[PDB]
Ligand binder design. Structure first.
Ligand SMILES: O=P(O)(O)OC[C@H]1O[C@](O)(COP(=O)(O)O)[C@@H](O)[C@@H]1O
Lengths: 498, 498
């Protein structure tokens, strides 16, 4: 009867839903894009409602199309886009303000003070994090700060805070349940990653009524259940929660320290499992929470690159330089190089390991003959460059050389990118079967959490290295190119006025 | 010293110039487009002046780049768009009306009369022509008729009639030379292909003062010279002239009865060398003048198809369905068939063998899934269908089965087209090296006329079968498909409101 696990993958640009079988086979999938609100340059919002809405309906759609019923869903996993923060009225469930997405750069001023009062370490030490508008804390504060009575009501606790998983879940339970998971919490900058609870100091400094937060639980547990109709008296359990990023790492099976992958998605996300030990970043990386071999706490080192697939979309939707008929790849391969062009995707400032919020998208070394294709390619390459960036610091931090790069996310389908990536890294890149582990991750979790499965062991046999990319450019080259990349990069930082 | 022949190819849509070496090599080439005026639908005009200006500059251009001087041009051959008619003031050399292009369906009524007073046969018998707005006569009179004092002045002979060559030359000789060649004259429907002179009844009938006509001469003789600057006192001989079509034939070296080609240009032009004997068409083809192996007269059978490259051109500029970067072919191949569609390029009415000036472009068989690619393709196919149509008339007329289609003209570079043609024909198609034999034809003639060459033989090994296409579709297919074409064709006929 209950033969399916269902994953809810609330992405940055679209909500998705995946139906999974015991054989961990994708049975059905649904997608719904939502609007990317840009109130003003460097600002990114989302509709708490639109999310919810798109996420729900899909959940429904997947099943529908597949002719599956509530009563066969063994459980539901949940992954989401991290850091993007939300605050609503507990009473009404009415946001008091749009979701402020992870890329949003507005919290910079605050970050500024933060810097100023010199917490660097505290934070790093307690959160694992780096001072950035990237993270939750700041966000919230801004909201409260921005809204009239907030703080009070917050304190009066009529006000509620949450990240995606949180929100979603709450919604799925008629606000019956208000919790998040570790992976998720570890990203707010209000959660102490060693102690494993909200950081008073943290809350203190940002000024955040504890009254606002949710119950932090384990990535794979039963948090509750939801009623979506069907044959009467059926409820589906919610037994899994990880931040997308972490979900992928899990889906990827990296549950053992030194295991890592790279996710080529909205941004680029490369994480490596640091076992049960927290590892300090010396290289401008993050220290976070991940999933033990069965969703228990673990840690990992992370490199966060804001712009990846996004760049591509931008090409397509903003620049209108490609369509979905004619691929980035298509064109990119029409030329044999950027023709010296470089693209600095600082569309949302920088990020690992730069962490500049004043940085802003730039294109370099243009000539009378550079054309679209050059650019397209250029864009595509930025991705890989960045990747290198973090990959490098990672060993630096990790103390470990990666023999090959594990990847995932649509972009990985881009053979070009792949190759390049490989070249430019001078490393074997391994492209698995199903590019969308992220969801498996969540499945696995919730699935595990409910005995659907006993352990990943069974799922060993699961991963298919569909392709393998080995380098084709020699060191010298590799280095040369990287250099320009580098050259480029700087010219973009500090761009934005404070 | 004089080492080069130069050919002027006055296209229907662009003037060209060509430089040839004694080895009959193309040294250089220049093109210059010009405006297709369409005063109203079914009408097609040209600015004599634009025709001229473009033709001249190219002549100049071609030499320039090639770094060649007047005093090295052994001689010049002229080739041009047939039937297209011009009338100007002898005094001033000012046209008194736009050039009426061969395509222009305006003289239809007049044509209607001619019919009615039953000259079918007479015309046909002396001209070898069919009754159509295609030919020159009607054209002339229409102008006359349309412009006030004309006739008189014409009788006063202050007015001059002429075809491209005619025009071009005068101009080149500063109105010092007013002539045409046979091939040309045969298209006026005022010249007797047997007698070899202006057909009195004809003029009588159209009311066309002999006064405005020119001395007819042979295709390869010295008509005079032209001053184009350079080393003081240098004149270039003009020693060759033929309707482009005929030029082409010659170029193809179809100088013996039974030899034939298929020109893929503005429209399609398939002519078969009928030796020195005029063969009557019982199949809706024309009987015309061509050149014996020495610029002597010959005859041929012809099939004129109004829309070939022009159709594409249209696809490109009007429909904007393709470009310079993305070819007819490009898309055409994106699909496996028209998906049932058919395109009847009656844009300018219908020609051989149909001869319906009231026909107009049409597209058939649309279904919801039909797309542009289909349409593009259908368009291309149209070419081949029409080819078929005439090819068969011709073999019937001719009584022989061509063992291969020899072709030429830009479109020939189109593989898809070439294949198809072949398929639908169920015949080998022989694609030669140099698609621009029209010009050669001319070169030859002129060069011939000046001893630049001694004779054709010299030029025998000049041609190369660049590609050979062989059928790949079955009689039934071949046949089925054709039908549809035929079906469609009808539906496009008689559209025009008399
Ligand atoms: O509506 P269903 O699925 O047919 O079952 C009826 C259920 O509705 C409820 O009244 C509300 O249940 P929940 O509040 O758990 O959603 C229960 O009392 C009852 O079991």
């Amino acid at each position: 009867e209950k033969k399916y696990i269902v994953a809810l993958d609330q992405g940055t640009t679209s909500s998705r839903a995946v139906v999974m079988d015991h054989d961990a086979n994708i049975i059905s999938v649904s997608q719904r894009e939502f609007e990317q609100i840009y109130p003003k340059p460097g600002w990114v919002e989302h509709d708490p409602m639109e999310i919810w809405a798109t996420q729900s309906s899909t959940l429904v759609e997947v099943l529908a199309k597949a002719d599956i019923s509530s009563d066969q869903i063994a459980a539901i996993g949940i992954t989401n886009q991290r850091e993007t923060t939300i605050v609503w009225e507990k009473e009404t469930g009415k946001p008091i303000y749009n979701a402020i997405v992870w890329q949003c750069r507005r919290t910079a001023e605050i970050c500024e003070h933060l810097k100023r009062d010199g917490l660097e370490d505290y934070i790093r030490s307690n959160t694992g994090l780096v001072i950035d508008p990237y993270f939750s804390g700041t966000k919230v504060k801004w909201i409260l700060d921005h809204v009239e009575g907030s703080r009070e009501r917050a304190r009066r606790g009529e006000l509620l805070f949450g990240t995606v998983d949180t929100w979603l879940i709450w919604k799925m339970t008629q606000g019956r349940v208000h919790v998040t998971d570790y992976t998720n919490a570890s990203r707010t900058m209000l959660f102490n990653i060693h102690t494993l609870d909200w950081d008073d100091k943290m809350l203190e400094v940002l000024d955040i009524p504890r009254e606002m937060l949710p119950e932090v639980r384990r990535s794979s547990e039963v948090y509750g259940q939801t009623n979506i109709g069907g044959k009467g008296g059926t409820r589906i359990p919610i037994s899994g929660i990880a931040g997308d990023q972490q979900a992928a790492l899990f889906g990827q099976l990296c549950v053992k320290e030194g295991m890592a992958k790279n996710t080529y998605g909205t941004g680029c996300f490369m994480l490596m499992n640091t076992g049960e030990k927290a590892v300090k970043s010396e290289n401008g990386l993050l220290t976070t929470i991940a999933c033990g071999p069965t969703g228990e706490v673990n840690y990992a080192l992370e490199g966060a690159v804001f712009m990846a697939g996004a760049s591509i979309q931008w090409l397509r939707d903003e620049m209108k330089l490609i369509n979905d008929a004619y691929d980035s790849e298509y064109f990119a391969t029409k030329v044999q190089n950027t023709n010296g062009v470089y693209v600095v995707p600082a569309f949302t400032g920088l990020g690992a390991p730069y962490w500049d919020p004043y940085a802003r998208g730039a294109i370099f070394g243009l000539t009378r003959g550079v054309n679209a294709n050059h650019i397209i390619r250029a864009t595509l390459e930025s991705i890989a460059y960045q990747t290198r960036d973090v990959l490098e610091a990672m060993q630096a931090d990790s103390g470990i050389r990666l023999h090959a790069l594990r990847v995932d996310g649509g972009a990985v389908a881009n053979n070009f990118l792949m190759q390049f990536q490989s070249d430019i890294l001078g490393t074997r890149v391994e492209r698995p079967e199903v590019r969308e582990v992220t969801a498996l991750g969540a499945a696995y979790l919730a699935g595990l959490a409910v005995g659907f499965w006993q352990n990943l062991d069974e799922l060993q046999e699961k991963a298919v290295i569909e392709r393998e990319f080995r380098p084709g450019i020699e060191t010298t080259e590799r280095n040369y190119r990287y250099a320009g990349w580098k050259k480029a990069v700087k010219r973009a930082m500090a761009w934005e006025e404070h």
